[PDB]
Amino acid sequence: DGQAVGEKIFKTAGAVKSYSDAEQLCREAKGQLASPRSSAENEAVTQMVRAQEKNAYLSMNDISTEGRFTYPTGEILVYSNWADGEPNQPENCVEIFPDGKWNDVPCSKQLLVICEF
Numbered sequence: 001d002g003q004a005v006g007e008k009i010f011k012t013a014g015a016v017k018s019y020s021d022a023e024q025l026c027r028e029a030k031g032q033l034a035s036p037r038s039s040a041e042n043e044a045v046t047q048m049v050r051a052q053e054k055n056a057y058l059s060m061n062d063i064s065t066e067g068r069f070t071y072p073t074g075e076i077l078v079y080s081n082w083a084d085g086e087p088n089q090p091e092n093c094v095e096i097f098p099d100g101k102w103n104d105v106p107c108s109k110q111l112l113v114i115c116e117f
C-alpha cells in the first residue's frame with residue numbers, strides 16, 4: 001500500500017539507506033525515489049515521513065551542476081519546498097522533514113526510502 005496523488009503512488013517499507021542504496025532499491029522495485037512535483041505530492045510524502053518518524057530522501061540532486069537540483073531525467077525542479085536557509089563535506093542530495101520542508105544533505109546520509117510508482 002501507500003499514499004497517492006493523481007496517478008502517482010508513494011510507498012515505503014521503512015528501509016533506511018544511503019542515497020545510492022536507496023536509488024537501487026526503488027529501481028529494482030521498478031520505481032524511482034520520491035520526486036514530489038507539487039504541493040499535493042509533497043504533502044503525501046510528508047505524511048509518510050511523519051508516520052515513520054524518519055526524514056526521507058527525495059530523488060533530486062545537484063551532482064551534475066552544483067546548486068542546480070535535477071530529477072533522474074536530468075530536468076530542473078518544477079517545485080521546491082526548501083527549509084529556511086536551504087540549500088545552506090558537500091551536500092548534493094535532498095532530505096524531506098516531517099514538516100514537509102527540504103534540506104540538502106551529504107549523499108552518504110542514511111534516510112528513509114520512499115519510492116514512487
Ligand SMILES: CC(=O)N[C@H]1[C@@H](OP(=O)(O)O)O[C@H](CO)[C@@H](O)[C@@H]1O
Binds near residue numbers: 091105
Ligand atoms: C547532515 C545534515 O543533515 N546536516 C544539516 C544540519 O547541519 P548541522 O551539522 O546541524 O549544522 O543542519 C543544517 C541547517 O542548520 C543543514 O543545512 C545541514 O544539511
Ligand SMILES: [Ca+2]
Binds near residue numbers: 062090092093
Ligand atoms: Ca550541492
Ligand SMILES: [Ca+2]
Binds near residue numbers: 086103104
Ligand atoms: Ca543543508
